[PDB]
Design an enzyme around this catalytic site. Structure first.
Site, PDB file in Angstrom:
ATOM      1  CG  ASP A   1      51.206  10.118 -51.056  1.00  0.00           C
ATOM      2  OD1 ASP A   1      51.319   9.186 -51.630  1.00  0.00           O
ATOM      3  OD2 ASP A   1      51.793  10.453 -49.979  1.00  0.00           O
ATOM      4  CD  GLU A   2      49.425   6.289 -52.334  1.00  0.00           C
ATOM      5  OE1 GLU A   2      50.426   6.432 -52.985  1.00  0.00           O
ATOM      6  OE2 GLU A   2      49.376   6.390 -50.799  1.00  0.00           O
TER       7      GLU A   2
ATOM      8  CE  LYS B   1      55.404  10.645 -50.221  1.00  0.00           C
ATOM      9  NZ  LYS B   1      54.575   9.337 -50.211  1.00  0.00           N
TER      10      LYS B   1
ATOM     11  CG  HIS C   1      49.549   5.247 -57.402  1.00  0.00           C
ATOM     12  ND1 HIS C   1      49.075   4.319 -56.371  1.00  0.00           N
ATOM     13  CD2 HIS C   1      50.494   5.825 -56.732  1.00  0.00           C
ATOM     14  CE1 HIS C   1      49.881   4.067 -55.548  1.00  0.00           C
ATOM     15  NE2 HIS C   1      50.815   4.923 -55.682  1.00  0.00           N
TER      16      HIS C   1
ATOM     17  CE  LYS D   1      52.322   9.852 -57.663  1.00  0.00           C
ATOM     18  NZ  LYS D   1      51.620   9.694 -56.449  1.00  0.00           N
TER      19      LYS D   1
ATOM     20  CE  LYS E   1      57.746   3.858 -49.756  1.00  0.00           C
ATOM     21  NZ  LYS E   1      57.554   5.084 -49.428  1.00  0.00           N
TER      22      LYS E   1
HETATM   23  O1  LIG Z   1      53.088   6.558 -51.279  1.00  0.00           O
HETATM   24  C1  LIG Z   1      54.434   6.394 -51.374  1.00  0.00           C
HETATM   25  O2  LIG Z   1      54.933   5.739 -50.602  1.00  0.00           O
HETATM   26  C2  LIG Z   1      54.873   6.979 -52.707  1.00  0.00           C
HETATM   27  O3  LIG Z   1      54.345   8.125 -52.946  1.00  0.00           O
HETATM   28  C3  LIG Z   1      56.397   7.124 -52.624  1.00  0.00           C
HETATM   29  O4  LIG Z   1      56.622   7.724 -51.697  1.00  0.00           O
HETATM   30  P1  LIG Z   1      58.347   8.191 -51.306  1.00  0.00           P
HETATM   31  O5  LIG Z   1      59.041   8.755 -52.591  1.00  0.00           O
HETATM   32  O6  LIG Z   1      58.721   8.939 -50.301  1.00  0.00           O
HETATM   33  O7  LIG Z   1      59.090   6.865 -51.098  1.00  0.00           O
HETATM   34  C4  LIG Z   1      54.554   6.207 -53.868  1.00  0.00           C
HETATM   35  O8  LIG Z   1      52.898   5.979 -54.062  1.00  0.00           O
HETATM   36  C5  LIG Z   1      55.050   4.624 -53.725  1.00  0.00           C
HETATM   37  O9  LIG Z   1      56.178   4.584 -54.476  1.00  0.00           O
HETATM   38  C6  LIG Z   1      53.768   3.781 -54.730  1.00  0.00           C
HETATM   39  O10 LIG Z   1      54.362   2.457 -54.535  1.00  0.00           O
HETATM   40  P2  LIG Z   1      54.708   1.593 -56.174  1.00  0.00           P
HETATM   41  O11 LIG Z   1      55.479   2.462 -57.120  1.00  0.00           O
HETATM   42  O12 LIG Z   1      55.541   0.304 -55.778  1.00  0.00           O
HETATM   43  O13 LIG Z   1      53.441   1.303 -56.706  1.00  0.00           O
HETATM   44 MG   LIG Z   2      52.073   7.639 -52.822  1.00  0.00          MG
END
Ligand SMILES: O=C(O)[C@@](O)(COP(=O)(O)O)[C@H](O)[C@H](O)COP(=O)(O)O
Ligand SMILES: [Mg+2]
Ligand SMILES: O=C(O)[C@@](O)(COP(=O)(O)O)[C@H](O)[C@H](O)COP(=O)(O)O
Ligand SMILES: O=C(O)[C@@](O)(COP(=O)(O)O)[C@H](O)[C@H](O)COP(=O)(O)O
Ligand SMILES: [Mg+2]
Ligand SMILES: [Mg+2]
Ligand SMILES: [Mg+2]
Lengths: 469, 140, 465, 356, 232
Positions: free
Chosen positions: A197-198, A169, A288, A195, A328
């Site tokens: 981020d997506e 982040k 993801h 990782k 969340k």
């Molecule tokens: O972009 C985000 O919010 C995260 O990197 C988590 O960040 P944090 O660890 O800071 O919360 C993940 O991609 C989400 O958890 C995806 O959701 P899911 O697993 O429900 O598909």
């Molecule tokens: Mg993410």
């Protein structure tokens, strides 16, 4: 000399051909469970038949070409309709599709038939695909996951606990050099993985190949420092197949363990290609599920996530995000336990209290490692270990990079918390009841963990669930 | 603000971030193996073969992805198939460590239904190892 | 401003009601339904944050970069008239957040995670403002409307197509037989059904070959250029390309792709191949209604249509308004303009939330298909005009006299309506008269008129403005 | 030669016993990738038989457990281990996972013992393209040896593979899976000696030869005959060993016979006496069935082989004194003693079907 | 704390593990029917069990590695033995093989297991594989035939009768030119196809590419002359 069934032009009811309540399903049929809300004045039988017809062989009026083939052999069949308890105008319609309808090894083709056009029919108000029965004879046409859970643990040499990960982040805006810097500091503190981020692909603030190189440096530094195997899911998600492959190739050439793909935004055709590449080149593939909640959130319309998860297992993926239950993002406990079993296990019996509408036999296709990620922190640890057990990866993005002392202390706090819970469980403690005590004893012992415990003590995510059974 | 030290702070996978296991804590892990019907086994390695490395990759084309040396250790006797007695496992730990007093020794257990190692942790490190920190010296 | 660990409200960073949007920003309009006890401002801010740079707790790494430069910004919130708990939240994203040329990347940010947040009950993406500076990074459609008409040498009327039926179960040889009989009677195109790929009853390469024979026979017989959309949709990129290659080698004009079930990454690849090899690319929107049907949650089709225009396609299915599948008139006219035109001004009465400048990116031919027949023709011509393809599957293969008479009936109906319009007749009022005069004249058309006279699709609309 | 004539109504049975391949035809073949001399030279192994071992159970082991078993086998004194003939790529273990774990195991055992090690990785596959993909992966891992089932894969694939092996410096171990479908009965089929000549022409560095004394059939005199055909440059007609024609191989390299199948330590003297040093002797069950595990199993077989070799070199007659040589060796080696004890009573003695 | 099933070194009868007369075959199993002739003093049950064992997971002595996996899951099973009417020492032994044993799409691998080693066992005098049940779940892993009967008739545009072919003779010894000359004269008279003899590949008297060319000339001449599709 008097005629049999001839061609008769014109519209007739779909139910005359496609509603077959006495049909005995074959063990090679693909079965679908649709939650269906008809328009007023449309009988549930005619609605189910329409869905069956227009996702298999039929259209809105009679066509003469039917007579050149055998409709009995090819037609989808609405074979059963259940009323929904608590609902005046909702039904579960069950449809059987002959295996002949489907292209071997193509999740794309399966979706195209089963969810292609029927959701937009004027005659229905809402439609949701709740489940699919994928028969062994169809499952066997898929390559499936590059490696799966057993092979992953064996290659990483990691056993006896959940794996720990972490998304870097802020989501966007970091330079390649700062990316690798953050990555190194996370991995060295006790996390197995970090990782992209997506939405980190290749952008003006950070080009992909610069990131890959700095991350490779970071992975090898942390590995040499800790003596444990490390990885970072490098994102191969891209605008074209050619770019995606280029990124996978660079990861292979760097000798790094693992890449990632956003399978819904990239799409099943690209994802299957990538999964096959990963199998042929020995790369782990982390999936993801970006965009899933656009499709799977609402109870009345869409596709439930469990079907999106089965589809991913067929297309190919070593990891798939599963939800956290407690973080969340939404995911009800029983629903989640249901599809985690569908992702991981070889054989899952029908169990409606978990949303499993069909017994699913995976016929030895490898299991996919669930990944719990999003809004979780050290206090969630007991509940996470209790829900998922050891065959999961638990990801702390904010819960690592938000630690008051930085990434390595944040990683160490998460690692301590996981190992303490794992140890307590193994010693016979009940994590559902004694979870708070386990974490409190651990905070008292570890200064890193204490700092994390203090900052996030009051933080909970408790809201009315939308996607209820 | 405490700083996690990068110097001589090597770890050993599961449970290595906790205080070193007492004999009672090891016994409890062993009970957990037996209660679940898993297959106990001991493995060991000399100090030079204890941590993951890359030396064989010199022989490779572009195929080093998830290849590491020193993942395999050496098996102590055979996996203890049919063992339902924790004291038997404890006796093999004693016998193994006695025969190899200067080796790293880990206890593992196998599940034969999943066909995977289901647990594992270090039970001995050589007295001459200087590459690790006590819990209270991991940060400064 | 040091690093302070812990959770704070998203609105402190991501709600910026005084922000002046830049002309390079990507804008988004979210129809948002907050959970009780969540202020709209904090909900919009959360959506802006978690689709751009932020997460649920404060991270120290923000200080290494410039959050002001990169953050998405919720800059405006409108209440929804008629709704107690629905808001339109407007979010601005800096151009720097997005990979050039990648619809995949744009979707991942803007719709990746935010729809699953516990703090909201429902979320729908209604529109996106794609700025010229981002549009210019995309190859876009292989050809577009002008070039397609020019290569086909077809002008002055809608194009006519037809899906072969039954959907599945026909052999390759019978496929080509049906194709030849449709094309020879007056249709410009026939097509593989969306789910016709490669199957036990019919392998793709056998179909491609028989269809190529059928195209060339119908073209030689009629003297008009013919095509059949051969489906390249497949399980993997390599299979998809193999099919595209075989079409190119047979010299046929057009292939098709299911862009949502295949996916944006495969589609963009295919579109680039089509550009480089001179193949037309027909896009089927299989799966869209899973996403775009419900008013309260999903992504509106107009956004899926903009995404396709960027990713690449010469044709895209648009709905019929009057046929078996849902599509409200005003909504449809809105996104047809978005697909075809260079410049579309904001117009909320058609669901256009933002002025859209396409900066000369080619237009995409709308395809009206599904449950339509000869009586719908006047309405179809009136809604779409000439720059559309109208497709009659059941409306051709359901004709009592077979495919060639079915095709002829549809072609007569189309040309009669076109002529009437050109002569000054109002198709909205005189449509029935135009068809009735044409049935009296053409026996093929009369047979079609008779069979489907009573058939209408009229139901309460779900996707209302 | 065997295309249609065996199905003619006018005959009741037909068997091809031998073929004379003339030098002028022999010279048109690439032949074996390396052959016995080059194999020993590259491995740097001389003065005894080579020792191998098939991993067991045949099917059902994971890739990680495969490598584990391989490492424990090689480290105890075996030169080679091998994929079972039917181990290709399967739901329980995909080929590329096996190749990687096996490569780790080879290099660990080699570093530990100081002797060159190998494992015959199976390239046998459904298609030529898959077969090649597997050969390529072995080459890229730097490992010494792959294997092929030449009759179930087929001659056309086998020759392709052998040429690839020649061009890339890989050893090629041939398994004769399916041969006994063709070569068992006296009255009808093709005798194994012809199948062996065919393999030498098609290309292989090793070929399974039978054991004579193990679980699978192979009469002594018949076997000695075709072993000469596989190894030697020139073999004179000799009907008492089933050689119907004088065979001149015109310098085509010899193929290393592999004795394998239901053999154990007590067979060692007889094996060394029948085959001499230019053979590989394989102990699957005879290694993985040892009461103390793979490494002690390997050590026992290696001790047995070395003791017999030494005894023969000192002038002892292995045909007569073989039991004494093994007994002296069991007294000396605890690993060997444990093997001697378990398999003492185990013999395979049955009426021979394929008689001269 | 009394031990379960441990590793016991040594030889035991195959029938203890691999003869399972109460096994219910699964619809995904590959089934084999072996006509089996045991050696004197070998019970049919032990012979069938040996065949089942050594074509699936087992060898001649007990191995410890069995315990790392699940033999129940992977073992071949001799589940039935029929005596052969008219025969004193012949039996049909039925064996079930789990689908997991086989490589998808590979006939080579299927043969390797089922007919690989068992025909050479000293303990039997003769063995014949009479039949195999290939389950749909295994069939579906194969590409199968390039076209098949329906598609062939459709591409050739030939219906309503058997097809007619002809092998060119003599088997060997004809030149490429004389091959094409023979081919043209056969096809023009009413045959749909001619063919290379099985042993016509590429030889000193006729190299393949010369043949292919002259044959192509012959096919197109006969097709133009007769108005019917021809092939060789
Ligand atoms: O972009 C985000 O919010 C995260 O990197 C988590 O960040 P944090 O660890 O800071 O919360 C993940 O991609 C989400 O958890 C995806 O959701 P899911 O697993 O429900 O598909
Ligand atoms: Mg993410
Ligand atoms: O599968 C079908 O139903 C069609 O072939 C039409 O058949 P008919 O011509 O026989 O009605 C089209 O694919 C749909 O129109 C797609 O819907 P949309 O264009 O809305 O995406
Ligand atoms: O599958 C088997 O039975 C073996 O692995 C030996 O196992 P064991 O060492 O455990 O007996 C060999 O493939 C056979 O020897 C082949 O027979 P042949 O050499 O006669 O072709
Ligand atoms: Mg269609
Ligand atoms: Mg074998
Ligand atoms: Mg012939």
């Amino acid at each position: 000399t008097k005629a049999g069934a001839g061609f008769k032009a014109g519209v007739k009811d779909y139910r005359l051909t496609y509603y077959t309540p006495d049909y005995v399903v074959r063990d090679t049929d693909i079965l679908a469970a649709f939650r269906m809300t008809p328009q007023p004045g449309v009988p549930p039988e005619e609605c189910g038949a329409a869905v069956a017809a227009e996702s298999s062989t039929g259209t809105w009026t009679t066509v003469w070409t039917d007579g050149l083939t055998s409709l009995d052999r090819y037609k989808g069949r609405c074979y059963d309709i259940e009323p929904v308890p608590g609902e005046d105008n909702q039904y579960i319609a069950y449809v059987a599709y002959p295996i002949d309808l489907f292209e071997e090894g193509s999740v794309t083709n399966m979706f195209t038939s089963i969810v292609g056009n029927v959701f937009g029919f004027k005659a229905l108000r809402a439609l949701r695909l709740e489940d699919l029965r994928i028969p062994p004879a169809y499952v066997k046409t898929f390559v499936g996951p590059p490696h799966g859970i057993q092979v992953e643990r064996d290659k990483l040499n990691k056993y006896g606990r959940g794996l720990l990960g972490c998304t870097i982040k802020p989501k966007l805006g970091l330079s390649a050099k700062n990316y690798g810097r953050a990555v190194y500091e996370c991995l060295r503190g006790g996390l197995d993985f970090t990782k992209d981020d997506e939405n980190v692909n290749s952008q003006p603030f950070m080009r992909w190949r610069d990131r890959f190189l700095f991350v490779a440096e970071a992975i090898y530094k942390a590995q040499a420092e800790t003596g444990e195997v490390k990885g970072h899911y490098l994102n191969a998600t891209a605008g074209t197949c050619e770019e995606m492959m280029k990124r996978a190739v660079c990861a292979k050439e760097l000798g790094v363990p693992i890449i990632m793909h956003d399978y819904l935004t990239g799409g099943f055709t690209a994802n299957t290609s990538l999964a096959i590449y990963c199998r042929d080149n020995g790369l782990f593939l982390h999936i993801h599920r970006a965009m899933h909640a656009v499709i799977d959130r609402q109870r009345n319309h869409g596709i439930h996530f469990r079907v999106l998860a089965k589809a991913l297992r067929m297309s190919g993926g070593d990891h798939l995000h599963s939800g956290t239950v407690v973080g969340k993002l939404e995911g009800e406990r029983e629903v989640t336990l249901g599809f985690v079993d569908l992702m991981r296990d070889d054989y899952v019996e029908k169990d409606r209290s978990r949303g499993i509408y069909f017994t699913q036999d995976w016929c030895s296709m490898p299991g996919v490692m669930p990944v719990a990620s999003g809004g979780i922190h050290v206090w969630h640890m007991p509940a996470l270990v209790e829900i998922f057990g050891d065959d999961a990866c638990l990801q702390f993005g904010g819960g690592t990079l938000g630690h008051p002392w930085g990434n390595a202390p944040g990683a160490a706090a998460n690692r301590v918390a996981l190992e303490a819970c794992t140890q307590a469980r193994n010693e016979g403690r009940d994590l559902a009841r004694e979870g708070g005590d386990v974490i409190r004893s651990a905070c008292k012992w570890s200064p890193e963990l204490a700092a994390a415990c203090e900052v996030w003590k009051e933080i909970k995510f408790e809201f009315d669930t939308i996607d209820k059974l | 603000m405490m700083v996690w030290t990068p110097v001589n702070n090597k770890m050993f996978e599961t449970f290595s971030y906790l205080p070193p296991l007492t004999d009672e804590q090891i016994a409890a892990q062993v009970d957990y193996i037996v209660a679940n019907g898993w297959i106990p086994c001991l493995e060991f390695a000399e100090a030079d073969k204890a941590y993951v490395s890359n030396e064989s990759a010199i022989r490779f084309g572009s195929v080093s992805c998830l290849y590491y040396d020193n993942r395999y250790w050496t098996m102590w006797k055979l996996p203890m198939f049919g063992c339902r007695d924790p004291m038997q496992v404890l006796r093999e730990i004693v016998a193994c460590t006695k025969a190899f007093p200067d080796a790293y020794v880990r206890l593992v257990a196998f599940d034969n239904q999943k066909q995977v190692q289901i647990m594992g942790f270090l039970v001995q490190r050589p007295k001459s190892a200087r590459d690790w920190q006590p819990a209270n010296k991991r940060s400064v």
